[PDB]
Amino acid sequence: IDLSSLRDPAGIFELVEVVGNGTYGQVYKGRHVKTGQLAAIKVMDVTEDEEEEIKLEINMLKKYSHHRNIATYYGAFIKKSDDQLWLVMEFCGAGSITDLVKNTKGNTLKEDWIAYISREILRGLAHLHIHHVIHRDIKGQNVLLTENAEVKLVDFGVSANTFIGTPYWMAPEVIACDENPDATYDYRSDLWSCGITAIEMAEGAPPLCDMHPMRALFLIPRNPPPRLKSKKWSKKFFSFIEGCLVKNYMQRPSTEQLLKHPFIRDQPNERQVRIQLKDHIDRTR
Numbered sequence: 405i406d407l408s409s410l411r412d413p414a415g416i417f418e419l420v421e422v423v424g425n426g427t428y429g430q431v432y433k434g435r436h437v438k439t440g441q442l443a444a445i446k447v448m449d450v451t452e453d454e455e456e457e458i459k460l461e462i463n464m465l466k467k468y469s470h471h472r473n474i475a476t477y478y479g480a481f482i483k484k485s486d487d488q489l490w491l492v493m494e495f496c497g498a499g500s501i502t503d504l505v506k507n508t509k510g511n512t513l514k515e516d517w518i519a520y521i522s523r524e525i526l527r528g529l530a531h532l533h534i535h536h537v538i539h540r541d542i543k544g545q546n547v548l549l550t551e552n553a554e555v556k557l558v559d560f561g562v563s564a565n566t567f568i569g570t571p572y573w574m575a576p577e578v579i580a581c582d583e584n585p586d587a588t589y590d591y592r593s594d595l596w597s598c599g600i601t602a603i604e605m606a607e608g609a610p611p612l613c614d615m616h617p618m619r620a621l622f623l624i625p626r627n628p629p630p631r632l633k634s635k636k637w638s639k640k641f642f643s644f645i646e647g648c649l650v651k652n653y654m655q656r657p658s659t660e661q662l663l664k665h666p667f668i669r670d671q672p673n674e675r676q677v678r679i680q681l682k683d684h685i686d687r688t689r
């Protein structure tokens with residue numbers, strides 16, 4: 405891509421309102437002027453400090469979004485002013501996974517809902533990993549739902565920055581310490597994040613949620629793998645969490661291996677779950 409040849413978004417796209425009020429920063433519910441179809445628009449300022457980082461988010465989202473579990477790239481635009489870069493993509497109108505769990509009774513999702521959502525996350529990750537892309541910011545806030553209960557991944561912003569985000573979904577290997585100065589990691593760091601996301605769906609919050617983020621950052625590399633608090637869950641669900649949450653990434657399974665895990669592989673009530681999720685989205689709307 406080249407920032408020079410990009411057109412002005414006037415009469416093509418318009419901003420409606422910010423989405424998630426700061427969760428994603430300068431991200432808006434947008435509208436394709438001519439059709440009225442919604443789009444999510446990421447608005448970044450084209451500063452010299454953040455100009456190469458800005459181009460890279462365009463290029464990545466552009467080539468790696470042609471998969472049903474990743475929100476699709478539409479186009480890039482520059483609104484000349486300090487110039488404003490607009491990154492336009494597919495709008496997912498039913499909120500994030502975090503929203504879904506906080507707007508549910510008892511801040512807990514049914515196990516078969518967790519199995520459905522976790523598989524869609526892993527299918528999106530398998531697409532990224534096969535194209536040598538690590539998502540790097542897997543969390544319930546970056547996993548969105550559409551009106552018809554489809555699950556899509558967002559944010560190539562930190563994909564492989566001046567502000568470090570939330571640390572709760574971060575794998576031990578991405579947190580630098582004395583025996584890990586270079587914070588050496590691979591695609592498996594997203595699988596740990598997927599495991600924390602499944603705990604988040606089961607409990608309504610990631611482990612260490614009650615800690616100061618800086619304290620969680622210190623604790624993640626030294627604490628044993630997090631575990632589900634309740635004993636109610638199936639053996640397969642406990643086994644899936646254990647798979648995602650292997651402390652040492654060197655023996656953590658691959659995305660392909662986790663997709664074959666009985667909890668992810670065996671979903672007999674798939675059809676009903678999709679209907680239940682749709683019903684939940686409609687009853688919240």
Ligand SMILES: Nc1ncnc2ccc(-c3ccnc(F)c3)nc12
Pocket residue numbers: 423424428431443444446475493494495496497548558559560561
């Ligand atoms: N596609 C979306 N539809 C609805 N709401 C959203 C909220 C955030 C992001 C988001 C967050 C961070 N970086 C992005 F590129 C997009 N994308 C969407």
Ligand SMILES: [Mg+2]
Pocket residue numbers: 469470471472473474475476
């Ligand atoms: Mg797509």
